[PDB]
Design a protein around this motif. Sequence first.
Motif, PDB file in Angstrom:
ATOM      1  N   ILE B   2      35.465  14.555 -15.526  1.00  0.00           N
ATOM      2  CA  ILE B   2      34.063  14.836 -15.295  1.00  0.00           C
ATOM      3  C   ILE B   2      33.471  13.622 -14.600  1.00  0.00           C
ATOM      4  O   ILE B   2      33.306  12.547 -15.208  1.00  0.00           O
ATOM      5  CB  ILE B   2      33.299  15.167 -16.612  1.00  0.00           C
ATOM      6  CG1 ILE B   2      33.696  16.545 -17.139  1.00  0.00           C
ATOM      7  CG2 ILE B   2      31.800  15.190 -16.378  1.00  0.00           C
ATOM      8  CD1 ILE B   2      34.934  16.555 -17.946  1.00  0.00           C
ATOM      9  N   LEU B 111      20.422   9.344 -16.068  1.00  0.00           N
ATOM     10  CA  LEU B 111      21.485  10.151 -16.682  1.00  0.00           C
ATOM     11  C   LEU B 111      21.531   9.969 -18.197  1.00  0.00           C
ATOM     12  O   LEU B 111      22.300   9.159 -18.697  1.00  0.00           O
ATOM     13  CB  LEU B 111      22.851   9.846 -16.061  1.00  0.00           C
ATOM     14  CG  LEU B 111      23.959  10.720 -16.656  1.00  0.00           C
ATOM     15  CD1 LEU B 111      23.950  12.133 -16.056  1.00  0.00           C
ATOM     16  CD2 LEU B 111      25.330  10.058 -16.531  1.00  0.00           C
ATOM     17  N   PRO B 112      20.705  10.720 -18.934  1.00  0.00           N
ATOM     18  CA  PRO B 112      20.818  10.635 -20.394  1.00  0.00           C
ATOM     19  C   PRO B 112      22.020  11.462 -20.848  1.00  0.00           C
ATOM     20  O   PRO B 112      22.253  12.564 -20.325  1.00  0.00           O
ATOM     21  CB  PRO B 112      19.507  11.248 -20.909  1.00  0.00           C
ATOM     22  CG  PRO B 112      18.784  11.793 -19.707  1.00  0.00           C
ATOM     23  CD  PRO B 112      19.666  11.669 -18.496  1.00  0.00           C
ATOM     24  N   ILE B 113      22.804  10.922 -21.771  1.00  0.00           N
ATOM     25  CA  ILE B 113      23.959  11.634 -22.264  1.00  0.00           C
ATOM     26  C   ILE B 113      23.735  12.003 -23.719  1.00  0.00           C
ATOM     27  O   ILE B 113      23.884  11.157 -24.613  1.00  0.00           O
ATOM     28  CB  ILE B 113      25.243  10.812 -22.091  1.00  0.00           C
ATOM     29  CG1 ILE B 113      25.426  10.446 -20.613  1.00  0.00           C
ATOM     30  CG2 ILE B 113      26.458  11.594 -22.580  1.00  0.00           C
ATOM     31  CD1 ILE B 113      26.462   9.363 -20.359  1.00  0.00           C
ATOM     32  N   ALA B 114      23.374  13.264 -23.949  1.00  0.00           N
ATOM     33  CA  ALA B 114      23.083  13.762 -25.300  1.00  0.00           C
ATOM     34  C   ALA B 114      24.335  13.809 -26.159  1.00  0.00           C
ATOM     35  O   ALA B 114      24.266  13.534 -27.351  1.00  0.00           O
ATOM     36  CB  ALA B 114      22.411  15.150 -25.244  1.00  0.00           C
ATOM     37  N   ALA B 115      25.467  14.167 -25.550  1.00  0.00           N
ATOM     38  CA  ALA B 115      26.787  14.149 -26.219  1.00  0.00           C
ATOM     39  C   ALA B 115      27.848  13.714 -25.213  1.00  0.00           C
ATOM     40  O   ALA B 115      27.842  14.157 -24.052  1.00  0.00           O
ATOM     41  CB  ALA B 115      27.131  15.511 -26.806  1.00  0.00           C
ATOM     42  N   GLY B 116      28.742  12.838 -25.656  1.00  0.00           N
ATOM     43  CA  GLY B 116      29.692  12.192 -24.760  1.00  0.00           C
ATOM     44  C   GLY B 116      29.328  10.750 -24.436  1.00  0.00           C
ATOM     45  O   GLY B 116      28.352  10.196 -24.961  1.00  0.00           O
ATOM     46  N   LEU B 136      32.678  10.796 -17.300  1.00  0.00           N
ATOM     47  CA  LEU B 136      32.219  11.155 -18.650  1.00  0.00           C
ATOM     48  C   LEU B 136      33.339  11.697 -19.512  1.00  0.00           C
ATOM     49  O   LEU B 136      34.143  12.511 -19.058  1.00  0.00           O
ATOM     50  CB  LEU B 136      31.080  12.177 -18.601  1.00  0.00           C
ATOM     51  CG  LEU B 136      29.827  11.812 -17.806  1.00  0.00           C
ATOM     52  CD1 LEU B 136      28.877  12.993 -17.738  1.00  0.00           C
ATOM     53  CD2 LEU B 136      29.158  10.637 -18.446  1.00  0.00           C
ATOM     54  N   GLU B 137      33.373  11.240 -20.761  1.00  0.00           N
ATOM     55  CA  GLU B 137      34.354  11.678 -21.755  1.00  0.00           C
ATOM     56  C   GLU B 137      33.580  12.271 -22.937  1.00  0.00           C
ATOM     57  O   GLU B 137      32.425  11.923 -23.144  1.00  0.00           O
ATOM     58  CB  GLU B 137      35.142  10.466 -22.248  1.00  0.00           C
ATOM     59  CG  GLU B 137      36.659  10.602 -22.203  1.00  0.00           C
ATOM     60  CD  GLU B 137      37.263   9.928 -20.971  1.00  0.00           C
ATOM     61  OE1 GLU B 137      38.187   9.088 -21.139  1.00  0.00           O
ATOM     62  OE2 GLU B 137      36.803  10.222 -19.840  1.00  0.00           O
ATOM     63  N   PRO B 138      34.204  13.169 -23.719  1.00  0.00           N
ATOM     64  CA  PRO B 138      33.524  13.648 -24.929  1.00  0.00           C
ATOM     65  C   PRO B 138      33.394  12.570 -26.014  1.00  0.00           C
ATOM     66  O   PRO B 138      32.501  12.663 -26.863  1.00  0.00           O
ATOM     67  CB  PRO B 138      34.446  14.772 -25.438  1.00  0.00           C
ATOM     68  CG  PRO B 138      35.385  15.057 -24.330  1.00  0.00           C
ATOM     69  CD  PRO B 138      35.524  13.805 -23.552  1.00  0.00           C
TER      70      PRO B 138
END
Lengths: 140, 138
Positions: B2, B111-116, B136-138
């Motif tokens: 990703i 770029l806010p990352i809610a999960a990951g 991006l990784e989980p």
Amino acid sequence: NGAIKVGAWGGNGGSAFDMGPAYRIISVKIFSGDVVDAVDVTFTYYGKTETRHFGGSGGTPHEIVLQEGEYLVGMKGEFGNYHGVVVVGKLGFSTNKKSYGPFGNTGGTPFSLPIAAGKISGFFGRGGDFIDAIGVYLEP
Amino acid sequence: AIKVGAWGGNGGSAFDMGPAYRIISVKIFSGDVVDAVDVTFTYYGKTETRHFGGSGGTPHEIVLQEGEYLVGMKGEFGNYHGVVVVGKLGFSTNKKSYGPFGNTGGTPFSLPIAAGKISGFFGRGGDFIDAIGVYLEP
Ligand SMILES: OC[C@H]1O[C@H](O[C@@H]2[C@H](O)[C@@H](O)O[C@H](CO)[C@H]2O)[C@@H](O)[C@@H](O)[C@@H]1O
Ligand SMILES: OC[C@H]1O[C@H](O[C@@H]2[C@H](O)[C@@H](O)O[C@H](CO)[C@H]2O)[C@@H](O)[C@@H](O)[C@@H]1O
Ligand SMILES: OC[C@H]1O[C@H](O)[C@@H](O)[C@@H](O)[C@@H]1O
Ligand SMILES: OC[C@H]1O[C@H](O)[C@@H](O)[C@@H](O)[C@@H]1O
Ligand SMILES: OC[C@H]1O[C@H](O)[C@@H](O)[C@@H](O)[C@@H]1O
Ligand SMILES: OC[C@H]1O[C@H](O)[C@@H](O)[C@@H](O)[C@@H]1O
Ligand SMILES: [Zn+2]
Ligand SMILES: [Zn+2]
Ligand SMILES: [Zn+2]
């Protein structure tokens, strides 16, 4: 559960929504006028094909029908104050085939999500009278 | 994989560090503009450092502690005396936020990352950091 979620972009008004990821987004319907009123997404999840209705019910519909092997690979827009409320005032998507939008007529703080590898698999955000905020699930 | 971004211009040479096991630290060199980034990370039992961009600017280290990850990136890009570069750059971890660094405004991106989490970088660089993007990784 291994999910990758980016966003949401927008304000803190309205109530949270979260459709989770899908097997296949079939179509995205953006309702807009001055501002982004709402987003309908119809999708298949574990065999079943559902439609969820986010945001409010005003505005004109703009439908993005995904063809076979067409995926959402980009989202952009602008959020800002709309007579008291920080909502998404412009919203657009691009696929591997074509660009759509942006829809809405209120300028504000731009955001952009180009995806160089991967695709959009679902949505979350906040909705009230309008689309307060929108965010996106990603998968390869 | 990703990959999201890159945000910025088309000048400079393309860089791609690939995804890492763990970001150890991010060093942001900036002045008027974001000059460069040092990323230290682990990779299949090796610890590595990559320099992207140029040698100008003052550095600001983001050192990641135990179970601290990068969950946000934001900045601004614009024309700076002839080249579209990252004029402001910032990051947030699960514990706190950093910067942003650089003093030249332009078109914002966030770029806010809610999960990951951010697991690596790619983009373009010359004597300044023309563009930055993220794995991006989980
Ligand atoms: O996208 C928001 C909204 O825009 C347009 O309606 C306006 C507003 O609802 C409000 O300020 O009342 C105005 C008075 O005339 C009106 O323009 C429409 O496009 C509407 O469908 C939409 O909900
Ligand atoms: O990273 C920015 C930029 O660096 C280099 O550009 C040069 C400098 O901007 C400066 O010395 O002026 C030159 C001529 O106007 C310019 O080439 C290059 O690496 C460039 O590709 C990059 O965008
Ligand atoms: O160009 C499409 C355009 O259609 C109408 O005028 C409205 O729904 C706008 O929100 C939208 O931008
Ligand atoms: O949708 C924008 C706006 O709609 C309503 O007025 C309320 O739900 C607000 O909380 C929300 O921010
Ligand atoms: O950011 C561009 C430029 O800004 C300032 O003039 C200094 O801090 C330099 O080190 C740097 O190269
Ligand atoms: O403005 C953010 C940042 O920009 C420059 O690179 C330096 O002067 C830093 O000390 C400062 O904190
Ligand atoms: Zn609906
Ligand atoms: Zn007003
Ligand atoms: Zn270095």
